Structure formats: C-alpha cells, structure tokens
Short mmCIF file of C-alpha atoms and ligand atoms in Angstrom, two decimals:
data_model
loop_
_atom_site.label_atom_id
_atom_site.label_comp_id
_atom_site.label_asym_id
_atom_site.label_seq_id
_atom_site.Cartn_x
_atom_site.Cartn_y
_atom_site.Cartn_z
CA UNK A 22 115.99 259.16 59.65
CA UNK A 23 113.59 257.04 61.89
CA UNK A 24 110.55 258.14 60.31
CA UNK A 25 109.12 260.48 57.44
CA UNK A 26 105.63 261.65 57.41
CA UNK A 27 104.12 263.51 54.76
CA UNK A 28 101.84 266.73 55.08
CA UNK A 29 99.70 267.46 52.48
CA UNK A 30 98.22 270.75 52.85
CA UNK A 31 94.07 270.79 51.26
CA UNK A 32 92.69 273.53 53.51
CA UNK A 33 92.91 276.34 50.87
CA UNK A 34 90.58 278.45 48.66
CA UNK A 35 91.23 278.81 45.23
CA UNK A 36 88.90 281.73 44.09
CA UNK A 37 90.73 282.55 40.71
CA UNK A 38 90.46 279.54 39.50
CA UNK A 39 86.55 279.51 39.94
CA UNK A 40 86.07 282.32 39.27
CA UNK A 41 88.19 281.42 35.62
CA UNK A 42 85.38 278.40 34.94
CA UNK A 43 82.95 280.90 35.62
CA UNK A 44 84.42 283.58 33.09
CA UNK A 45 83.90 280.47 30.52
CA UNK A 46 81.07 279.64 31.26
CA UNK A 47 81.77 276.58 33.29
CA UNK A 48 79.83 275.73 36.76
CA UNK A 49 82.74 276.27 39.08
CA UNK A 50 84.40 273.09 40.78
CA UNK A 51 87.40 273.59 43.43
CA UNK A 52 90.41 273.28 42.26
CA UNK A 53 90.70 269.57 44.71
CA UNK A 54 87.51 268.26 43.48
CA UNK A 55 88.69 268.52 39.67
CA UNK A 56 88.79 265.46 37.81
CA UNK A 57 92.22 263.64 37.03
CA UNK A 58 93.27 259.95 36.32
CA UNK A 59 89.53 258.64 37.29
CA UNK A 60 89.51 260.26 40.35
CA UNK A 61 90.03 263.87 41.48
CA UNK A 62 93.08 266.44 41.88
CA UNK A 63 93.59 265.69 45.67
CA UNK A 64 93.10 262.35 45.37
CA UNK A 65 95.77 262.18 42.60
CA UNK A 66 97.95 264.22 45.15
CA UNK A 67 97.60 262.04 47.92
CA UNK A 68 98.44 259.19 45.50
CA UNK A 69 102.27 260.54 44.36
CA UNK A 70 103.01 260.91 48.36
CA UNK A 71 102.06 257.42 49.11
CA UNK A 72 103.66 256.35 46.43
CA UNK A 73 107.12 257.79 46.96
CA UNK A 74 107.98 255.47 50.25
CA UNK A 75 105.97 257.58 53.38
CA UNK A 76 105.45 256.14 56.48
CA UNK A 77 102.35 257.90 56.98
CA UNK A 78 100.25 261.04 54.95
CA UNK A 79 98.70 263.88 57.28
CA UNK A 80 95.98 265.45 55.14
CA UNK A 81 94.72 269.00 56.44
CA UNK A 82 91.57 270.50 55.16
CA UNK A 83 89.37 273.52 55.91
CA UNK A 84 87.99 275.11 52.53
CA UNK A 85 84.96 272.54 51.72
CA UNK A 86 86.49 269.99 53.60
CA UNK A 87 83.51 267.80 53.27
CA UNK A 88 83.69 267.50 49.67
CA UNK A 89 87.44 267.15 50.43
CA UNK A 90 87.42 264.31 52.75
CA UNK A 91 84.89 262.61 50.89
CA UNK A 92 87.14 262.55 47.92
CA UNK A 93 89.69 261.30 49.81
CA UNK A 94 87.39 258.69 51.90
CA UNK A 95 89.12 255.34 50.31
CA UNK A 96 92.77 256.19 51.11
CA UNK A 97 95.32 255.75 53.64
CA UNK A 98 95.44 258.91 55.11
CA UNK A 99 95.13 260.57 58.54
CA UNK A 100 92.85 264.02 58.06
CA UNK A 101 93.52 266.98 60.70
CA UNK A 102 90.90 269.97 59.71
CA UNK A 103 92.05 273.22 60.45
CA UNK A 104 89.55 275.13 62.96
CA UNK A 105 89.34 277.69 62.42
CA UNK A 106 89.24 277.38 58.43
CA UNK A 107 90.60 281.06 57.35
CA UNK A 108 94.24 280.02 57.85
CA UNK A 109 97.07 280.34 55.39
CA UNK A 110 99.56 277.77 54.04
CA UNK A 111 102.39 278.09 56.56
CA UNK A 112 99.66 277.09 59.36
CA UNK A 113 97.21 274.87 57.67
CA UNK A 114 101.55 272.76 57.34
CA UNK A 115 102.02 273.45 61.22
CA UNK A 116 98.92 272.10 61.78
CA UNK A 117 99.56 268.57 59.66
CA UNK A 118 103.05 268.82 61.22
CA UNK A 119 101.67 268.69 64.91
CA UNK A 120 99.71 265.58 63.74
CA UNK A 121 102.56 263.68 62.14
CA UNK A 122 105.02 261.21 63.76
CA UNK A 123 107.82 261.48 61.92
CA UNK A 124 111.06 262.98 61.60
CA UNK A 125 111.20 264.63 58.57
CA UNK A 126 108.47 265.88 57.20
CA UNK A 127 107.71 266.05 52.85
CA UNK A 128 105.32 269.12 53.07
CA UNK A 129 103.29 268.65 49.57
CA UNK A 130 100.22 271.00 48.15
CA UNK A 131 97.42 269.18 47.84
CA UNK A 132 96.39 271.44 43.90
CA UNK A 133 100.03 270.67 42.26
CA UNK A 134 99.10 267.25 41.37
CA UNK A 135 102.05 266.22 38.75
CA UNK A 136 104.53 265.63 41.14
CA UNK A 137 105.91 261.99 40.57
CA UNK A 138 106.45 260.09 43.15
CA UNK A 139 110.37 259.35 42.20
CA UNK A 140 110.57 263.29 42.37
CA UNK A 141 109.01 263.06 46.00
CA UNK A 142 110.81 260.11 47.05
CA UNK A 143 114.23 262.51 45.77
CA UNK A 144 112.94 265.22 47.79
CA UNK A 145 112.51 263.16 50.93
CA UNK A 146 116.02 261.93 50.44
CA UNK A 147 117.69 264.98 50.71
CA UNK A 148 116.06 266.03 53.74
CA UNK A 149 117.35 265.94 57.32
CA UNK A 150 117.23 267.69 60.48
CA UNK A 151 119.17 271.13 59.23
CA UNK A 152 118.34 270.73 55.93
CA UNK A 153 115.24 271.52 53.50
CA UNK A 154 115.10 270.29 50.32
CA UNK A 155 112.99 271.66 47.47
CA UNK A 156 111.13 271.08 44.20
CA UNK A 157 114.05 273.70 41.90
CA UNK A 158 112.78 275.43 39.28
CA UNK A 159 116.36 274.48 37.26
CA UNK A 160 118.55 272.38 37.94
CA UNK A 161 119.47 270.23 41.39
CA UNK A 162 122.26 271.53 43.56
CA UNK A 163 122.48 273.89 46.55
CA UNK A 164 120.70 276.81 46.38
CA UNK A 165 120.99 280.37 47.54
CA UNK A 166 117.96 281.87 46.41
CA UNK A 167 113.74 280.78 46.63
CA UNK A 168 113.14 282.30 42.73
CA UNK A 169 110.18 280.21 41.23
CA UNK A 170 109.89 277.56 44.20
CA UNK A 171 107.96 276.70 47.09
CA UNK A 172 106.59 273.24 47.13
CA UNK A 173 107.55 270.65 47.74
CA UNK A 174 109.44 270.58 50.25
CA UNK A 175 110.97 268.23 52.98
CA UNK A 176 112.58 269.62 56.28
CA UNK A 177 113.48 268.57 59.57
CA UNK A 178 110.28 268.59 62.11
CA UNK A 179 111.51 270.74 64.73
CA UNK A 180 112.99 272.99 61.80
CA UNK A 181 109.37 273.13 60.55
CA UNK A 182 108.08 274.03 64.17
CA UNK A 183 110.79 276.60 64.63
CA UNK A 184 109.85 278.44 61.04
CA UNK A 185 106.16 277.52 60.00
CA UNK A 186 104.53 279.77 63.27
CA UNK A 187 106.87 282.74 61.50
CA UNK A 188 106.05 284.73 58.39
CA UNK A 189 103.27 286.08 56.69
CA UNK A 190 101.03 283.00 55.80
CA UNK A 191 102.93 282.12 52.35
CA UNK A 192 105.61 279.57 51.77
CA UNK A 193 108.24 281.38 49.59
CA UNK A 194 108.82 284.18 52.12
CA UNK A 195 109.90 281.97 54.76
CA UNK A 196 112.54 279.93 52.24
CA UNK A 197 113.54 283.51 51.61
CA UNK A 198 113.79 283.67 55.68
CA UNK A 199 115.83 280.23 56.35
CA UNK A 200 118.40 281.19 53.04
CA UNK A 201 119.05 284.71 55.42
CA UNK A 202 119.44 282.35 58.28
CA UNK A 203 121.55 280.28 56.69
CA UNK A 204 119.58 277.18 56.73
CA UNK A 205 121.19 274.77 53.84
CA UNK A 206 118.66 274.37 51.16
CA UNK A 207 118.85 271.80 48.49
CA UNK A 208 116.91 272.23 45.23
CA UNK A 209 115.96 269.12 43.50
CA UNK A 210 115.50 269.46 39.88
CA UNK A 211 111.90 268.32 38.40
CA UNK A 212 111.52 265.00 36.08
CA UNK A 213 109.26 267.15 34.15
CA UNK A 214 108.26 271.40 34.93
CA UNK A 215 104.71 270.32 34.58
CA UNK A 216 105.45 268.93 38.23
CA UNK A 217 106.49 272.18 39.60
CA UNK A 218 102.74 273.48 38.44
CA UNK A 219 100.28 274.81 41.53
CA UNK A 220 96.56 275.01 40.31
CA UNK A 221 96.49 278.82 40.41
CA UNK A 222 94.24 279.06 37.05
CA UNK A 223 91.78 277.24 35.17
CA UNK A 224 94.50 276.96 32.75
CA UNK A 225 96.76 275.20 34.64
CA UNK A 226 94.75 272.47 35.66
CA UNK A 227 94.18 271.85 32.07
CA UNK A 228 97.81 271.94 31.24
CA UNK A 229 98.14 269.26 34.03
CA UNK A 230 95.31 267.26 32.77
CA UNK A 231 96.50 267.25 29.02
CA UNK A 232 100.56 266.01 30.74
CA UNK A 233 98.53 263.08 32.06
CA UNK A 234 96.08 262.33 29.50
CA UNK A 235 99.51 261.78 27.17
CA UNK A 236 100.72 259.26 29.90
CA UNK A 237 97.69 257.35 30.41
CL1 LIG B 1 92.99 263.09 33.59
CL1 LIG B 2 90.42 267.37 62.80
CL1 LIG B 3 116.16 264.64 62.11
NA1 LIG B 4 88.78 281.98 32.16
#
C-alpha cells in the first residue's frame, strides 16, 4: 500500500478484428488506433487508468507501436516496447511490471476501453500483496472460479513476478492456476457489462462506441 502502478498492456495483434472491417468492406484500422471520445481506443484506455487514482501508468507496446505511441504522445505515461514484438499477454504484463514502481500493480488491456475509472479505482482497492482482484462477470464477492474474466486485474508485484513468467501466454489460464494454488481472488462486479468488453470483433468495438456515444 505504498504505491500502485498501472500496466496497460498495447503490444498485441488483433487480426480478427481487421480482418472483420475488411469482410465489410472497411480499410482495416487496429483495434488501438480506432476512434472513441475524440481520440482513439488506447488513448481512451489510458484515460480510465489515470483517472482512477494511479501513481504512475506503464504502457507496453510491440504490434505497430509507432502508430501506438504516437496516439498516446500527449499523455502521462511511461512506454516500455516489448523486443522482441511476438510476445503474448502474460509477458508483454511482466514486461510493464519490471518497469513499474509500485506495489500493486492494476494490470489493464489496452482494447477494453469501457472500463470506468470508479470500477478501476474498486479494483485497485481490493488488491494487496496475496490477493488479486478482478473485473467479475456477476456479481462482487470471492471467487472460486475464472468463468468469463480476465482483465482487469490488480495483484501484488512479486505475486505478478512469481505467476506472469508461468503459463501459456493467455491471462485466464493462469487465474485458473492461482484459484488451484489457492491464491484469494476477489471479483469485482462491473458498473456496466459493456466494461467487461475486450475488442475481439469489429462488432464489439461498435457496441463500445454506441455505450459512449449515449454518454457523451
Ligand atoms: Cl465515440
Ligand atoms: Cl522500450
Ligand atoms: Cl504488497
Ligand atoms: Na465483418
């Protein structure tokens, strides 16, 4: 409780969803570089984290990190790029984890933009140095099962560098790993499910852009 830094991992492809604007007839965009509130998707991102209390945001990026960091050239933000770039999730997190300062670290995808920053400030709450707390698919309360969740997430730093090195590259498996373990993990229930949306799909990024068209 001395210090929480947030990770927001923006290293990723996101082929499906390109290749979705293509199937319409769209010029592909990545998923980070779609507009959303006047800016883009990673920008809007970045935004919740600082706004829910952070002492600091790590942003990694790999996949047109350029484009990436360009987007996100006005902010507050401290930008580790993964080298190589063909990483996966769990180490494109260890690697904004070895660049943070703090604590406890809120772990946040940079392509599920609807997250409100009271819902990240919760999730940062509940965190300390045994236990992870979670984005729930339902309602809040202790969990014993990773159904439908993933990000995001806040943990203990040295639990993050004891688990993120471990699995297969994917989030959910190693929740599924620390429940086995017995690691304590609290699930935090959404202000709204749009927040617990990943841009996996075209569609879902305009499900996410219609939730904040409605609220300005
Ligand atoms: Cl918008
Ligand atoms: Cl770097
Ligand atoms: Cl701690
Ligand atoms: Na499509």
């Amino acid at each position: 409780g001395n210090m929480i830094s947030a990770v927001v991992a923006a290293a990723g492809r996101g082929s499906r969803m390109m290749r979705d604007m293509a199937e319409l007839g769209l010029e592909p965009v990545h998923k980070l570089l779609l507009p959303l509130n006047g800016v883009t998707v990673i920008e809007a991102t970045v935004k919740a984290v600082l706004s829910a209390g952070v002492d600091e945001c790590i942003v990694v990026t790999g996949h047109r990190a350029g484009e990436v960091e360009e987007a996100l050239s006005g902010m507050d933000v401290r930008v580790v790029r993964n080298d190589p770039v063909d990483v996966p999730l769990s180490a494109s997190l260890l690697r904004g984890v070895r660049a943070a300062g703090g604590d406890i670290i809120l772990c946040a995808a940079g392509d599920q933009p609807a997250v409100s920053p009271a819902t990240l400030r919760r999730i940062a709450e509940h965190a300390d140095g045994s236990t992870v707390s979670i984005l729930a698919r339902g309602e809040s309360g202790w969990l014993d099962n990773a159904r439908g969740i993933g990000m995001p997430l806040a943990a203990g730093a040295d639990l993050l560098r004891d688990y993120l090195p471990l699995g297969d590259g994917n989030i959910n498996p190693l929740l599924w790993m620390m429940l086995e373990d017995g690691v304590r993990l609290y699930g935090v229930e959404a202000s709204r499910p749009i927040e617990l949306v990943n841009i996996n799909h075209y569609s879902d990024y305009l499900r996410i852009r219609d939730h904040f068209l409605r609220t300005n």
